[PDB]
Design a protein around this nucleic acid. Structure first.
Ligand SMILES: [Zn+2]
Lengths: 108, 1012, 187, 199, 147, 184
DNA sequence: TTGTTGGGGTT
RNA sequence: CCCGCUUAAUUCAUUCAGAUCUGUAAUAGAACUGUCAUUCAACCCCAAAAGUGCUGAUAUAACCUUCACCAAUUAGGUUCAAAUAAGUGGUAAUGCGGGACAAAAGACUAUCGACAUUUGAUACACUAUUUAUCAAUGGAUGUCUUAUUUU
């Protein structure tokens, strides 16, 4: 119906974009919601405790503010009993940024 | 009552099933479900296919497929993809028509075999139905329903839904079975008689070895405690010791001994084997007869068996009285015919369980629940009986005798001693090695044939003057990895030759292969005969001698490679066919399944890739029905390819290197095809059809050059020729002898069993022996040249007939087996030649009279086998028939109902459907009365049947007589109204009814029939 | 450590080999569409009993051991293994089939599988077996598959049998695809 | 002998008429119990006056048959060994069981006792089951497994429950029981007295 | 004849380019470096409250690069729901409308809405990564396949 | 479905119809009026079209078609034939079910054809009739092919892998040699 | 390491 | 008819294969050892699921009648019951002993909750089983007397 595009980026891209709607996916932090990427963390808009019990993970689609602050428009969680990898995810992100694969993820 | 019809429409037969709730043609299913409206326009082909299609459904679902007007029925998906989706919806269910030759993987169907019903599924008519339904209704109509489509005149072809192959389908102790048929055909013989050197009586020889060799009886699961087992092992050791003290020499010498002149016969045979020149003829014949008239009789061998058991088995192993009942039953165990067998219940039901001594009971269960103890000790008496029989009686009768049946006597048994059979073996290996066969070594056979085809085997059956051989091929070599015997290899070629055989009646000679074609030829000839004016007739009969061994490879293979009635590439299809049996339509209780109306048959066929105008490519089957009663077909996915090259290789092999074994000596035939191959019966007729057709051009035209009606029929051997012009038959005999002179065969015993008289010197046939008769006796026939009517020849003495009825009865489901048994014996021959065109009315009555008289005598042993089993001590029949005099009433029941069935069958086999129902009623009652009169007058003098049953049978016969009288009395008043216009056959039947005065008494008719 | 491969490579290396070779690979495919139209079991003895003598009334006796045995029911099914490339028709033997039926329904034991299927097919309860099979569709696994190029009835044929069936680990599937695509861009 | 033949014919005609064979009826029971009223020839061989007139078996058989072949009431044909007249001529130890599951039917406890192997009589009512025997030695015969030294408990298993039984009844109850028995016996006596007199 | 794992953005682009360039051979197969009809994809399946559709049960699949409209089926003899949606309803309803990504195989046909065949619930992030790589790899496995 | 096609032994039909073709040809054109033969020999024109007999109707499975260059593929077990056809009218005649691919058809009448190419002749094959008898979708891996549109180069490929195809290549070579010997 | 009854005719 | 008891004598013969021995003229004779194999022929054709119009007529019919077994031939009665008969053909028999309750009965205060049935129900069984318990029911079982070995 209407195309709400929300790409995947890294954490340095969080500051490189300087304002954009993107998707960031990582793990929650234990202590007004704050989540860890990778180390380093980042704050959000959703309530720290509103999220459910069994989940240990997070993905959000929304606009990114300057740095360490991102707006959350949509939020999804799930119960991952395995240590989530990051190196291969980083590889997928980078090769998505590449030129030979650019026509796959986004248009233009 | 509910007689049978000769024309139906499958709509009725599907409406009258139980498990179905909805059946109709697709046109009404659409009008009801409102997918179409009456005043629509569709071309006549599509509308006709809508009209004659049939659909069935277990539950009325006219509501589920109601047209909701929410979504338009505009299609873009191909029919292949919609049907893909249908099989996809079927998921894992594993039996449907559209799911034949197709396997699913994930969400993709995959076709991998040939289903020749698709060409109706992916048709254009089904494309139109998809356009009409829309996919979302199609892909469910192809599951919820059963779709048949008329593809032949009446025979529907199922294309979608469930296959009817799935409407045609706590544990207990099943007593063992005594291996009787192991005693029959042995040929071993040792120096000192006894029992085989591998049997455990001679195994390397205390109880240790008995345990080592009785691993299957000692540690069976019937013996409760160890004590029972060990006492039984003790009894087995005692059995063995008591058996090893027997002078088999003397023991045989006393009761059943070699003849007084045996040395003379041994000398004669040794002389006839030594001599190098071709020996005498009558000496060998008399030698055969003097050898075959030295066979032991049942009584002597029975005394032998009793005397050999009385001193080999301790007494208390069976008990004082059970042992005696055993030894008394052993006789009937001996004198039984070839294809019978005796059941352990026969021995048990007349024994006492406590009478034995060595029992022991763990929990003392004897008195509280005596019935459990009785059962759980019958399950040991049975095993002991079977052990005794199958480990003494059978090996003795195997080693020490030879057991067979003669050639012409029938199915009886016959016990010859062993050396007499070794003699006849030597004498026949001599008399045989000169006519056709010849000894052969192994290397005279190539290695490809050695490693591809199976070997043979030969059995000898005594005949009156000489022997008779019979070849068996059932073996398949364990090594070299062959899994098929010879006929399993030649089945495909035999199918090709069947498709060819369907054409030899008019193409390349003079042959027949069944009773249908014979009856057809008779109808045509009798039509010509009543046309010209029924003059005097003459006949002639003759038959080739040893046809299957007079034919040479050369002309056979040459005719085969140079005939165009065998196309080059043939495909083979397998399917299932469903026909209508004789049950009448049950006019409408709550359980009426398909098997109550339909017979299943699993047929194959071989079609040609050409555009033969029978189009086996579009239907998938080729069937011949005798009348318009519906039938169903469903195909299968198991096709194969065959080519004349491989058939040629097969014929070359079976006609060149046909190697058969005998007595561990390998033989090889010299010229001819082996008798006993499924292909041979057609090859022989084909080959001799070539010759007889090339020699008989004078037949095709003699009806128009001079006008003489004349037929010539010919089975595999027995010719037969009927004519009006003597000269034709004479010239025929001359031409056939000429063909025999030129091509190299000769006729058997010169028995030209003609009807006339002629000087046999004017034609160089003087050596022929004319045998003048007045009733042409072809293969079991009595063709009467005064009315040219047919019937059969029946044996006429109770022993003659007794020797060809093998009774095998079990208390399980009597009312079924016996029923069909008797029914079969009424239709086994009468159904064929009861056609009303051949015979007149009185001829029909005569045939019925004689065949009923024969079938009563054929059945009677079954009745006397029944009356020897008590039907009081069984609930299954006593609950329904009563508790006293149950036997006679049960018998009266099955007799009456089988007579009603056979009466209906005859009543429709005589008439069409258009005749009045009072005529059918009269003749119904008349056939029933004749059969019951025969059964009464034969049964009114027996012993067990004289007191009670005769009253019931007399009442039944009087009832049938009065019913006949009522019908034939009412019919005249019925016709008094003029309310029916009498056709020809009806007027003829009415004259048959009035002339013989069926009103008052049947007396006028029995003189007209009873004379043979 | 191992070296994995997809389906099409196996189909190639098997449809292009000489008769008699047997070799195994490892795939990250998935099982599907367990066949049911053929017979679902066969009989065996403990000591590799060649043939258990067939009786009716449910009696049995062996000759490869010379004792009276309770015959054993080994069940062998037919299914399909897929990946993102292609399809392989595979056979499945007693231990692996028992492992499957255990993984779908833990009620049945390692030795109760054949018993359960025999009892359900004889009693007249197949719907439970049918749905039990149907709930196995598209179950992702990790396969070690053996192929052998034999010949039967004097005509050439090719068959694939299953050897190992484990549960998967995405963390390794992703690394596998990563090295594959990196090598691919590297040329 | 021919004279012996006439003598035998006369003697058999005298001893075959039922006029004498009714008031005497010594062999009449045998003749009626015969297969078809046709007794054998040896049936006369058990007599006395035939042996003194005799002075092998088949020889005398054929002799008697010849002597009878001339008769008028008898019959002899087909060398039948039997001969018949062609005229009809018609005319202190007992115990008690307790603790039983209330509601136990009869057959269960009957067989739970019958497992012992010897007969008995039991009378059950709600709990109390009086069991008695017929031989005095039965007590010490069955004691080693009714007084089950395995459990040292007088235990009977019925329908899934153990009930107790006694080893010896007090003899006052035993006397009441013997009076009960003789009472039932006189009951039967008077029952059948009245039934003999009710008509 | 073969499945191709690709994302919703690629689906939209292919359907756009095909429905806007109708000068292709009239094979119902789409064309992305070859003929294909089935696809695999992981995305956020959520229902869509449509207007009284008894035959069909429409849905929707949002993902990181687009949003399409999938369509489901239902047994006609009895409008119950199959296993693959019964389980999702159960779990989503229990955990309180907390949606999870799904891995779905779906069958796309032109001139009609995109059917869906099956899906399973994912409970591990690495899945996405895997799927990502898969597409990338399979991309080349057709590009160099045409050259 | 391998055996049903394999046991056709198509090579027999091909050998026999080629023998018939060569026999009929160098039996009908023995005038040897060298001027008339020079007038006949023109480049890329049909010289002789031998329609096969009636008994040689082999049936096989289509694996791939191309319509503008008139190329049809056929296969049976281990051998895959590359042939031609008359025109799209043919496919319109053989009533296919869904798609020209993956269908198993019989062949009512095909024919050999003789063409002249650069410096030599050419033996072409043309299928004139077909009828689809069934569908089957199986991935057959025929190890060896043969092309009836690329001269001796079309057949001599893979000749060292089958006695049957070796002897067929031998017959084809002998046929072209006898052709160029007669007419040149 | 997988792939059940017995008639009638003819030889 | 039923029941108990009872049935002997060196070989009538010794294929096929092997190894010996004696003599041998191409033969003969003597002693010995080893020993069923997957045991079922095929073709054509025909049938093959779980209910009487319970049954009034034609004495010119139906039954009944005879000393082993059964079956095919002769004579006499008989009208819904029963009567004694005569030939012929095929299967079957060693001898020894045993065969007065015989019924209209009465008496038995003989026996009897452990009698004895006959109906029911409940149990264990069933492919043609000879039972147990309870209930109701009343008679049941042995003797004497109308009784004398030419039995
Ligand atoms: Zn074993």
């Amino acid at each position: 119906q209407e195309q709400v595009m929300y790409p995947r980026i890294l954490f340095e891209q969080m500051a490189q974009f300087r304002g954009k709607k993107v998707t960031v996916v990582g793990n929650v932090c234990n202590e007004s919601l704050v989540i860890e990427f990778g180390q380093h963390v980042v704050i959000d808009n959703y309530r720290r405790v509103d999220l459910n019990n069994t989940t240990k993970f997070v993905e959000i689609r929304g606009v990114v503010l300057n740095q360490n602050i991102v707006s959350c428009e949509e939020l999804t969680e799930f119960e991952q009993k395995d240590p989530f990898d990051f190196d291969t995810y980083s590889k997928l992100i980078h090769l998505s940024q590449s030129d030979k694969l650019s026509s796959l993820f986004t248009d233009q | 009552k509910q007689m049978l019809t000769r024309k139906e429409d499958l709509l009725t037969v599907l409406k009258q099933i139980s498990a179905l709730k909805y059946v109709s043609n697709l046109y009404e299913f659409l009008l009801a479900t409102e997918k179409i409206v009456q005043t629509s326009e569709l071309d006549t082909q599509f509308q006709e296919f809508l009209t004659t299609t049939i659909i069935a459904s277990e539950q009325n679902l006219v509501e589920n497929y109601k047209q909701k007007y929410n979504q338009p029925n505009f299609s873009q998906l191909t029919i292949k993809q919609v049907i893909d989706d249908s099989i996809i919806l079927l998921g894992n269910k594993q039996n449907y028509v559209q799911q034949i030759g197709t396997t699913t993987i994930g969400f993709y169907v995959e076709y991998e075999n040939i289903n020749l019903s698709r060409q109706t599924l992916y048709s254009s008519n089904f494309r139109n139905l998809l356009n009409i339904f829309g996919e979302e209704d199609f892909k469910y109509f192809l599951i919820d329903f059963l779709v048949f489509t008329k593809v032949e005149q009446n025979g529907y072809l199922q294309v979608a839904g469930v296959c009817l192959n799935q409407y045609f389908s706590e544990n207990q102790y099943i007593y063992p079975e005594i291996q009787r048929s192991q005693i029959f055909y042995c040929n071993h013989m040792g120096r000192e008689p006894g029992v085989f050197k591998s049997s455990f009586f001679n195994y390397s020889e205390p109880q240790t070895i008995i345990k080592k060799t009785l691993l299957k009886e000692y540690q069976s699961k019937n013996f409760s405690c160890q004590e029972e087992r060990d006492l039984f092992l003790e009894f087995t050791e005692k059995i063995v010791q008591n058996f090893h003290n027997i002078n088999f020499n003397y023991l045989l010498k006393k009761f059943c001994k070699l003849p007084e002149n045996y040395q003379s016969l041994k000398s004669q045979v040794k002389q006839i084997v030594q001599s190098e020149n071709k020996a005498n003829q009558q000496s060998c014949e008399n030698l055969f007869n003097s050898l075959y008239d030295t066979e032991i009789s049942y009584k002597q061998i029975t005394n032998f068996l009793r005397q050999i058991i009385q001193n080999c088995v301790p007494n208390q192993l069976l008990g004082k009285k059970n042992f005696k009942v055993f030894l008394e039953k052993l006789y009937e165990f001996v004198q039984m015919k070839r294809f019978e067998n005796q059941k352990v219940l026969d021995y048990i039901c007349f024994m006492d369980v406590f009478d034995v001594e060595w029992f022991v009971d763990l929990k003392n269960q004897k008195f509280t629940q005596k019935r459990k103890y009785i059962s759980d000790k019958r399950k040991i008496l049975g095993d002991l009986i079977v052990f005794i029989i199958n480990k003494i009686v059978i090996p003795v009768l195997r080693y020490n005798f030879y057991i067979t049946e003669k050639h012409k006597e029938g199915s009886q048994i016959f016990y010859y001693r062993k050396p007499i059979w070794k003699l006849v073996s030597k004498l026949t290996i001599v008399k045989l090695e000169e006519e056709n066969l010849e000894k052969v070594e192994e290397k005279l056979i190539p290695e490809d044939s050695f490693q591809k085809y199976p070997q043979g085997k030969l059995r000898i059956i005594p005949k009156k003057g000489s022997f008779r051989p019979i070849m068996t091929f059932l073996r398949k070599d364990k090594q070299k990895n062959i899994k098929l015997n010879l006929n399993q290899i030649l089945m495909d070629s035999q199918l090709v030759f069947r498709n060819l055989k369907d054409m030899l009646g008019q193409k390349i000679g003079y042959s027949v292969f069944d009773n249908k074609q014979i009856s057809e030829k008779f109808a045509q000839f009798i039509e010509k005969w009543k046309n010209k004016g029924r003059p005097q007739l003459y006949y002639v009969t003759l038959d080739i001698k040893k046809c299957y061994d007079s034919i040479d490879q050369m002309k056979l293979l040459n005719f085969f490679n140079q005939s165009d009635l065998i196309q080059d590439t043939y495909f083979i299809n397998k399917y299932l066919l469903f026909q209508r049996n004789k049950r009448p339509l049950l006019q409408i209780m709550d359980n009426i399944n398909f098997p109550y109306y339909f017979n299943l048959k699993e047929r194959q066929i071989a079609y040609s890739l050409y555009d033969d105008d029978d189009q086996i490519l579009q239907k998938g089957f080729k069937e011949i029905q005798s009348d318009d009663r519906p039938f169903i077909v469903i195909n299968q996915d198991k096709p194969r390819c065959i080519t004349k090259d491989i058939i040629h290789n097969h014929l070359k092999h079976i006609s060149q290197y046909n190697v058969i074994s005998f007595n561990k000596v390998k033989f090889r035939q010299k010229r001819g095809i082996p008798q006993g191959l499924n292909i041979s019966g057609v090859l022989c007729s084909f080959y001799f059809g070539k010759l007889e057709e090339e020699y008989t051009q004078f037949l095709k035209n003699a009806e128009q050059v001079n006008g003489s009606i004349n037929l010539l029929m010919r089975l595999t051997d027995d010719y037969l020729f009927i004519s009006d012009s003597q000269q034709n038959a004479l010239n025929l005999i001359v031409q056939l002898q000429n063909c025999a002179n030129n091509n190299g065969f000769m006729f058997n015993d010169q028995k030209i069993t003609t009807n006339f008289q002629f000087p046999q010197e004017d034609y160089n046939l003087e050596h022929f022996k004319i045998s003048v008769q007045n009733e042409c006796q072809w293969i079991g026939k009595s063709i009467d040249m005064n009315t040219l009517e047919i019937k059969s020849i029946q044996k006429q003495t109770q022993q003659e007939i007794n020797q060809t009825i093998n009774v095998a009865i079990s208390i399980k489901n009597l009312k079924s087996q016996l029923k069909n048994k008797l029914r079969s014996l009424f239709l086994n021959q009468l159904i064929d030649y009861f056609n009303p065109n051949i015979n007149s009315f009185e001829g029909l009555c005569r045939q019925l009279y004689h065949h009923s008289k024969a079938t009563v005598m054929k059945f009677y042993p079954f009745m006397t086998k029944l009356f020897q089993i008590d039907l009081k001590k069984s609930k299954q029949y006593s609950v329904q028939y009563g508790k006293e005099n149950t036997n006679e009433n049960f018998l009266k029941d099955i007799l009456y109902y089988t007579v009603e069935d056979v009466c209906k069958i005859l009543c429709y086999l005589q008439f069409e459907d258009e005749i009045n129902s009072n005529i059918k009623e009269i003749f119904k009652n008349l056939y029933s009365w004749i059969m019951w009169d025969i059964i009464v007058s034969y049964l009114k003098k027996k012993k067990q049947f004289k007191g009670y049953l005769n009253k019931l049978l007399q009442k039944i016969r009087k009832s049938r007589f009065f019913y006949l009288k009522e019908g034939c009395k009412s019919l005249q008043l019925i016709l008094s109204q003029q309310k029916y216009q009498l056709n020809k056959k009806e007027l003829e039947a009415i004259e048959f009814i009035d002339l013989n005065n069926l009103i008052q008494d049947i007396k006028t008719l029995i003189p007209k029939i009873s004379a043979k | 450590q191992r070296i994995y491969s997809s389906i099409e490579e196996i189909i190639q290396q098997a449809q292009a080999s000489e008769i008699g070779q047997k070799k195994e690979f490892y795939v990250y495919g998935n099982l599907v569409s367990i066949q049911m139209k053929n017979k679902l079991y066969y009989y065996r003895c403990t000591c590799q009993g060649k043939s258990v003598l067939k009786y009716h009334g449910d009696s049995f006796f062996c000759e490869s051991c010379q004792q009276f045995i309770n015959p054993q029911v080994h069940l062998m099914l037919r299914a399909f293994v897929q990946d993102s490339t292609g399809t392989i028709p595979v056979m499945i033997f007693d231990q692996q089939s028992s492992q499957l039926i255990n993984q779908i329904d833990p009620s049945i034991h390692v030795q109760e599988a054949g018993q359960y299927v025999k009892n359900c097919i004889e009693n007249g309860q197949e719907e439970i077996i049918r749905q039990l099979f149907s709930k196995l569709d598209f179950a992702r696994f990790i396969f070690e598959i053996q192929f052998e190029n034999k010949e039967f009835n004097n005509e050439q044929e090719i068959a694939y049998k299953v050897l190992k069936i484990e549960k998967e680990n995405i963390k390794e599937e992703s690394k596998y695809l990563l090295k594959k695509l990196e090598h691919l861009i590297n040329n | 002998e021919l004279d012996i033949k006439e003598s035998l014919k006369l003697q058999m005609e005298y001893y075959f008429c039922d006029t004498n064979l009714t008031h005497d009826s010594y062999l009449r029971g045998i003749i009626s119990k015969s297969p078809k009223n046709c007794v054998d020839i040896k049936v006369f061989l058990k007599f006395n006056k035939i042996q003194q007139i005799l002075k092998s078996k088949k020889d005398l058989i054929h002799l008697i048959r010849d002597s009878l072949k001339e008769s008028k009431i008898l019959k002899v044909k087909m060398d039948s060994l039997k001969v018949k007249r062609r005229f009809p001529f018609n005319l202190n130890c007992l115990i008690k069981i307790i603790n039983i599951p209330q509601g136990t039917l009869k057959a269960e406890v009957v067989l739970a006792v019958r497992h012992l192997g010897y007969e008995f009589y039991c009378d059950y009512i709600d709990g109390q089951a009086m069991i008695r025997f017929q031989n005095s030695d039965e007590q010490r015969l069955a004691i080693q497994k009714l007084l089950n030294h395995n459990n040292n408990k007088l235990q009977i298993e019925i329908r899934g429950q153990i009930c107790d039984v006694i080893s010896t009844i007090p003899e006052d109850e035993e006397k009441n029981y013997w009076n009960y028995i003789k009472f039932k016996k006189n009951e039967f006596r008077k029952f059948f007295f009245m039934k003999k007199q009710q008509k | 004849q073969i499945t191709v794992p690709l994302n919703c953005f690629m689906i939209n682009q292919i359907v756009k380019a095909a429905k806007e360039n109708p000068q292709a051979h009239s094979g119902n197969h789409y064309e992305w470096y070859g003929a294909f009809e089935n696809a695999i994809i992981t995305a956020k399946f959520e229902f869509l409250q449509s207007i009284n559709d008894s035959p069909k049960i429409m849905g929707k699949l949002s993902d990181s690069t687009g949003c399409i409209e999938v369509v489901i089926q239902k047994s006609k003899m009895s409008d119950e729901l199959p296993e693959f949606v019964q389980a999702y309803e159960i779990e989503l309803q229990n955990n309180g409308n907390r949606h999870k990504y799904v891995r779905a195989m779906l069958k796309m046909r032109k001139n009609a809405q995109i059917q869906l065949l099956y899906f399973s619930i994912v409970n591990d992030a690495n899945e996405i990564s895997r799927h990502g790589l898969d597409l990338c790899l399979r991309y080349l496995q057709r590009k160099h396949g045409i050259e | 479905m391998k055996l049903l096609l394999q046991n056709q032994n198509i090579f027999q039909k091909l050998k026999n119809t080629l023998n018939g073709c060569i026999k009929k040809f160098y039996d009908t054109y023995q005038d040897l009026e060298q001027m008339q033969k020079f007038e006949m020999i023109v480049e890329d024109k049909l010289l002789f079209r031998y329609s096969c007999s009636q008994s040689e109707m082999f049936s096989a499975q289509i694996q791939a078609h191309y319509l503008e260059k008139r190329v049809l593929q056929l296969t049976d077990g281990n051998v895959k034939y590359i042939v031609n056809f008359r025109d799209k009218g043919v496919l319109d005649k053989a009533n296919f079910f869904d798609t020209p691919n993956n269908s198993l058809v019989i062949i009512r009448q095909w024919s050999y054809e003789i063409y002249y190419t650069k410096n030599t002749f050419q033996i072409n094959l043309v299928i004139d009739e077909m009828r689809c008898i069934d569908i089957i979708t199986t991935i057959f891996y025929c190890k060896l092919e043969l092309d009836f549109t690329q001269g001796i180069k079309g057949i001599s490929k893979s000749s060292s892998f089958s006695n049957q195809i070796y002897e067929y290549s031998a017959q084809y070579y002998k046929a072209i040699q006898l052709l160029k010997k007669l007419l040149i």
